[PDB]
Structure 1
C-alpha cells in the first residue's frame, strides 16, 4: 500500500470504527473503491453538517464538491466537526480517488454531484411531507445505496441488475437513514436539528420539541410508532435487494447494517425511552447479528423474529396499528 492509501485506511478506522473490518473484507477492487467512497461521503457530510459554515459559502461547496475530487490541491481548513481531518487532508483522499479505476471514479463523482445539489436544496427548509422526507433521504442516503450498488456491478462481482435497480438500492439507504432519524430524535433536538417530517409530527403536537415534555409522552410514542411504520415499508425492497447478491463479502457488507437497523427499530417501537435518550442495541446483541447475517435464510429469520416481536407489542389503540400489522404481514408472506 502507498502511504496515501494507508492514511486512507487509518481514516476509515477512525471514522467507521468496527465497521471498518467489514469494508476491509470486500473482495478485489471493491475494497479500495468503497473505502474511498466512504471517506469522500464523510467529507461531504461534514460540510453539510457544519452549522458554522454560512449558507453563501456552503452552497458552492456542496455544488462543486464533485469537482474537488479532481483538484489535487483542494482542501478545506475551516471545519469545526469531529471528522474534520478528512477535509483538512482531502488531497490524500482525492489522490487515492484518482488512483481508482475510472469506472469507480465516475460512479463516485456522479453521486457526489447529485447529492450536493440535493443537500444544497434542503439547507433552507425542514422536511414537511412524507414525500419530502423520502426526497431528503434520497439525497443523503438513498444515493449512497445507489452508488455502492454501481460499484458492485461495475466491479463485476455482482450482476448488472444490482447497479441498475435504483429503487431497491435507494430503499437500502432510506431504511438506514430513517432508522437513524427516528432513533436520534432527542440528540437532534438538543443540537437544534429537526428531521422528523413536520406533516406527521404536526398532527400530534404544535412544535417538534414538545415531544420532549412529559405531558406529551403518549402523543410522542404514537408519532414514533407511525414513523417506524413508515420505515418498515422499505423492508420488502431490502429483502429483494439482499436476495440478489452473489458475492459473500458484498452480502455481509450490505446485510449487516440492515439487520442492525431492524433490531434498532424493534428496540425503539412503542418505547418512551426514545424521548429521554439514545436507545441502542447491546454490543453483544450487535456482535451476534453481525456474525449471523451471512445468508438469506438467516437474514430473513432475523427480520421475521424482530417483526413478530413488534407485531405482538402493537397497542390496539395505537393510531397506526392496522398499518403496522399490514406491513408486517406483507414482509412475512413475501419470502
Structure 2
C-alpha cells in the first residue's frame, strides 16, 4: 500500500546486494522492522564513510543521528557516496521508522545512538590493541547483532533470551566483522583505510602497508594466521546463538552470513592470495553439497568441517600453530 514503504524497499534492494532478499523473507513485523533498521544503519554508515564531510561536521552528525529519526524534515544533501539516496530522502525512511511499533523504535534509536558515539570515537584514531579491535567491531557490527536480536525477541518470534544475551549477539557481529576486516586487507590498504590491530601487526612489520610488499609475504601470512586465530574464538558463541533460534526465517537470516564467514576464514587461512587480491570462497566436500544452512545440525556440520579445513593446513613453522590447533580443539569438544 504505502508508497513510502514501497520506497523504503526500493532502497533496501538498492543498498543491500545480498541481505535484501533474506530480510524480505522475515516473518510478520520483523520484516519492516529490519528493513528500516537496515536503512537507518545504511545512512549512518554512508555519512561515516564519506570523506568529503569534515570531521567538524561529521562528529555532530554521527552523535545526533538517532534523534534525526524523530525530526520529520531532516535530510542531508552534501553526501557524494554511492548510497546517498537514503540520506537525501531520509524523511521517507524516517517516516516509516515512526510507524513501527514503539518497542521496535526503542531498539533502533538506541543502537543508532551508541553506534554514532562509537563511530565518532574512531574518526581520529586507528585500532591499536586487540582490545580496541573488539571495541571497534562492537561499534560497527556487534551492536547490529545486539539490535537485531532485541528486535527478534521484542516481536516474540524468538525467546526473550535471544535479546538478553548481548554477549552472544555481539559475538555474531564481531565474527562477521573480523572476518571481513581480515579478508579486505589489500582493498582497504589501497583505500587508505587501516583496521588490523596495530599491536598485532607491529610485531611483524614497520607499517601495516608493508604486507603488500612481496619481501614481506611470509610475515604477512603469519600475521594473517594470528588474526584468524583470534576470530575463531567467536565460534562457540555463534553456535550457541544459532542453536537458540526457533523461527525459520530468522534462522536463515542469521545462519547464512555466519556460514559464509567461516568459509571465508577457511579460504584465507595461510593463504598468500589475501595480499594479492580478494580470495576464493570455494567448493566444499560432498558432505556440504548434501546440506544447506537451513537447520542447526546441518550448520554445526558445515562449521566444524570448515574448522578442520583450517586445522589440516596449520604448518608447524607458523608462530600461532599451537594456539590455532588449541582453539579448534576446544570448539570440537564442546
Aligned equivalents of 2:285 and 2:201: distance in 1?
Answer: 31
Tell which deviates more after alignment, 43-52 or 284-293: 284-293
> How much does 1:148 deviate?
0.2
Q: 1:159 to 1:76 in 2, by over 3 A?
A: same
Retained in 2: the 8 A contact 1:65–1:113?
yes
- Map 1:30-179 to 2 at 5 A: 30-179=30-179
> How much does 1:188 deviate?
0.4
Q: TM-score, normalised by structure 1?
A: 0.97
Aligned equivalents of 2:291 and 2:87: distance in 1?
Answer: 33
Retained in 2: the 8 A contact 1:256–1:289?
no
Aligned equivalents of 1:285 and 1:64: distance in 2?
Answer: 49
Retained in 1: the 8 A contact 2:267–2:282?
no
Aligned equivalents of 1:14 and 1:293: distance in 2?
Answer: 25
Q: 1:154 to 1:183 in 2, by over 3 A?
A: same
Q: 1:34 to 1:224 in 2, by over 3 A?
A: same
**Gaps (5+ residues) in structure 2?**
none
Retained in 1: the 8 A contact 2:205–2:219?
yes
> How much does 1:286 deviate?
15
Tell which deviates more after alignment, 82-91 or 231-240: 82-91
Q: 1:242 to 1:120 in 2, by over 3 A?
A: same
| SS of equivalent to 2:286 | helix
Retained in 1: the 8 A contact 2:107–2:151?
yes
Count of equivalent residues: 334
Aligned equivalents of 2:148 and 2:332: distance in 1?
Answer: 27
1:139-171 Cα offsets, whole Å, 9 max, x none, are 110000000000000000111110010100000
> How much does 1:198 deviate?
0.3
Q: 1:282 to 1:10 in 2, by over 3 A?
A: farther
| Equivalent position of 2:259 in the other structure | 259
1:233-252 Cα offsets, whole Å, 9 max, x none, are 00000000001011111011
> How much does 1:19 deviate?
2.5
> How much does 1:287 deviate?
15
**Gaps (5+ residues) in structure 1?**
none
Retained in 2: the 8 A contact 1:59–1:120?
yes
Retained in 2: the 8 A contact 1:11–1:86?
yes
> How much does 1:51 deviate?
1.3
Aligned equivalents of 2:287 and 2:91: distance in 1?
Answer: 35
Q: 1:76 to 1:163 in 2, by over 3 A?
A: same
> How much does 1:89 deviate?
1.1
1:63-116 Cα offsets, whole Å, 9 max, x none, are 000000001111111111111111111111101101100100110000000010
Q: 1:51 to 1:284 in 2, by over 3 A?
A: farther
| Equivalent position of 1:279 in the other structure | 279
> How much does 1:285 deviate?
11
Q: 1:68 to 1:280 in 2, by over 3 A?
A: farther
Q: TM-score, normalised by structure 2?
A: 0.97
Q: 1:325 to 1:168 in 2, by over 3 A?
A: same
1:35-63 Cα offsets, whole Å, 9 max, x none, are 11011101011111111111110000000
> How much does 1:10 deviate?
1.0
Retained in 1: the 8 A contact 2:291–2:298?
no
> How much does 1:315 deviate?
0.7
| Equivalent position of 1:195 in the other structure | 195
| Equivalent position of 2:27 in the other structure | 27
Q: 1:333 to 1:288 in 2, by over 3 A?
A: closer
> How much does 1:270 deviate?
0.5
| Equivalent position of 1:236 in the other structure | 236
> How much does 1:232 deviate?
0.5
Retained in 1: the 8 A contact 2:288–2:302?
no
Q: 1:286 to 1:182 in 2, by over 3 A?
A: farther
Superposition misfits of 4+ residues, deviation over 4 angstroms:
282-291
Retained in 2: the 8 A contact 1:146–1:170?
yes
> How much does 1:215 deviate?
0.1
Retained in 2: the 8 A contact 1:152–1:158?
yes
| SS of equivalent to 1:171 | helix
Provide the aligned C-alpha RMSD in A.
Answer: 1.9
